[PDB]
Amino acid sequence: SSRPATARKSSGLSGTVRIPGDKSISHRSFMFGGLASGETRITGLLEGEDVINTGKAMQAMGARIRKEGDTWIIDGVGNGGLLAPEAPLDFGNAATGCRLTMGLVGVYDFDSTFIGDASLTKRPMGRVLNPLREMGVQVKSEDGDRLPVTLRGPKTPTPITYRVPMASAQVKSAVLLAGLNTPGITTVIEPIMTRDHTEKMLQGFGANLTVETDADGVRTIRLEGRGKLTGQVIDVPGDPSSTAFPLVAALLVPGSDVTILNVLMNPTRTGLILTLQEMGADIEVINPRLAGGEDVADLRVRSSTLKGVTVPEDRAPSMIDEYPILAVAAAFAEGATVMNGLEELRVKESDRLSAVANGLKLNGVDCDEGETSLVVRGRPDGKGLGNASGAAVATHLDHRIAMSFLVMGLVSENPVTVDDATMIATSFPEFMDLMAGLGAKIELS
Ligand SMILES: O=C(O)C1=C[C@@H](OP(=O)(O)O)[C@@H](O)[C@H](O[C@@](OP(=O)(O)O)(C(=O)O)C(F)F)C1
Numbered sequence: 001s002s003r004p005a006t007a008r009k010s011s012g013l014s015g016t017v018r019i020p021g022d023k024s025i026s027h028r029s030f031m032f033g034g035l036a037s038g039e040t041r042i043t044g045l046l047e048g049e050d051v052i053n054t055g056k057a058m059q060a061m062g063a064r065i066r067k068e069g070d071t072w073i074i075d076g077v078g079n080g081g082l083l084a085p086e087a088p089l090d091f092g093n094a095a096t097g098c099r100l101t102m103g104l105v106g107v108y109d110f111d112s113t114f115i116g117d118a119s120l121t122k123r124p125m126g127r128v129l130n131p132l133r134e135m136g137v138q139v140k141s142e143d144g145d146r147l148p149v150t151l152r153g154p155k156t157p158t159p160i161t162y163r164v165p166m167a168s169a170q171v172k173s174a175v176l177l178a179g180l181n182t183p184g185i186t187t188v189i190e191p192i193m194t195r196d197h198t199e200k201m202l203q204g205f206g207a208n209l210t211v212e213t214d215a216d217g218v219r220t221i222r223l224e225g226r227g228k229l230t231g232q233v234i235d236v237p238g239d240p241s242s243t244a245f246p247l248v249a250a251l252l253v254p255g256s257d258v259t260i261l262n263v264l265m266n267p268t269r270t271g272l273i274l275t276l277q278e279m280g281a282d283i284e285v286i287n288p289r290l291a292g293g294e295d296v297a298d299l300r301v302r303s304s305t306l307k308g309v310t311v312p313e314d315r316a317p318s319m320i321d322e323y324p325i326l327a328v329a330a331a332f333a334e335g336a337t338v339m340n341g342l343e344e345l346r347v348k349e350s351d352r353l354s355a356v357a358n359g360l361k362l363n364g365v366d367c368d369e370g371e372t373s374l375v376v377r378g379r380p381d382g383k384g385l386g387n388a389s390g391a392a393v394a395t396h397l398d399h400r401i402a403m404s405f406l407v408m409g410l411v412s413e414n415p416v417t418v419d420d421a422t423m424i425a426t427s428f429p430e431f432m433d434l435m436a437g438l439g440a441k442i443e444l445s
Helices: 023-035 047-059 095-107 126-134 169-179 198-203 240-252 270-280 313-318 319-328 345-346 352-362 399-409 422-426 433-438
Strands: 005-008 015-020 037-043 065-069 071-077 113-117 138-142 146-152 160-163 184-190 209-213 219-224 233-235 257-264 282-291 294-302 338-342 366-369 373-377 417-420 441-444
Touching: 005 399, 015 433, 023 037, 023 065, 023 071, 023 095, 023 198, 023 233, 037 184, 047 065, 047 095, 095 113, 095 126, 095 146, 095 169, 126 138, 126 169, 126 294, 169 198, 169 219, 184 282, 198 233, 233 294, 233 441, 240 270, 240 294, 240 319, 240 345, 240 399, 240 433, 270 282, 270 313, 270 319, 282 433, 313 319, 319 338, 319 345, 319 352, 319 373, 319 399, 345 352, 352 366, 366 417, 399 417, 417 433, 433 441
Parallel strands: 015 257, 037 233, 160 184
Antiparallel strands: 005 417, 005 441, 037 071, 065 071, 113 146, 138 146, 184 219, 209 219, 257 294, 282 294, 338 373, 366 373
């Protein structure tokens, strides 16, 4: 069932900690490692529930996965070598695993079924199912193109050129993965850049994949299908979405100085840091380096006084998952913060725009929720914020709503309670221990 947790006002947060691995890259390490020819070795893998579910799905299709010491070792089946799964592939809470695997296996000439939890089962799959239908995949789904879904690929898939209609890295990724088992050239056109882990990693595994960016920013991504993929050595960088929680906590809690090590700094993932810096945040980028083919750095974060800012719609893709924690930081900034271009927040683990606005109001914050926007006016000293009666924020099975509001309680005059902390382990099982080590006071019911 559910397990509520309550966060209480803290004295400064202090320490140096290594953040857990990046979820986006961890999911893809299991997928590409499972598909490629030969052996793939992975260090720094995120072992949250979401990633483990992807691992079990690849095993169900023939990949062998094991953990030796601190390294995950995978024996892949080779491109075109996936085997028909015996039972439905259960992705739990993870849309990333579900949507990417739909493209990967949907083009194979055997049936595959996809299921998930109460949250995933309400999310839209049409955005990935439509291009697959164009590629010749037969689709069976519930009303609204929701799970459960059963796919059956054609004997010979059809390559397509697909312009992604919304700024989704998962749709782009699903089409490219379907392209791996399709003869000919598959092309994805992305008018606004989204996280590029799929493109970079496929190139690293040997795929004939090119990316061309027009001066106007439009990206044309071409992949030649049915080519060989070769197992690789992968070093996963720290998760920038997970980093956001102790980072914002350190900015807000007076008397704080927290350093987070080995953080992924790919610009498609750093919109929150840029936004916080414009608000006056003291974030130091230390020893920027190249690790495992990605840009990483350590970040030293210190208590700062923040001021409201305008966050443009075009920055959304580079920080889509950090809007909840940004909304909490704004609740303590001087003045108003306005964020627009938020339509995508409504189809995540929870409708994040509605869950954030209701949670902020329950905890005394002045804010205005629009169809696709949010305005927050802060109270720097935190007085009158939080909930003295102990009323719980509804998380709607969304672990980022739970983590964002627990950070708020470390700063507000009154404690902040969330109705469920059990979903935090989907992407950040280390959260409670990591925050407690820095000095945070969070009581688990
Ligand atoms: O390809 C990826 O790795 C992701 C792409 C994005 O989705 P879109 O392509 O729809 O923009 C993120 O929002 C998603 O993160 C969440 O991913 P999951 O649903 O759990 O898998 C998250 O971590 O918060 C979010 F979508 F909920 C992970």
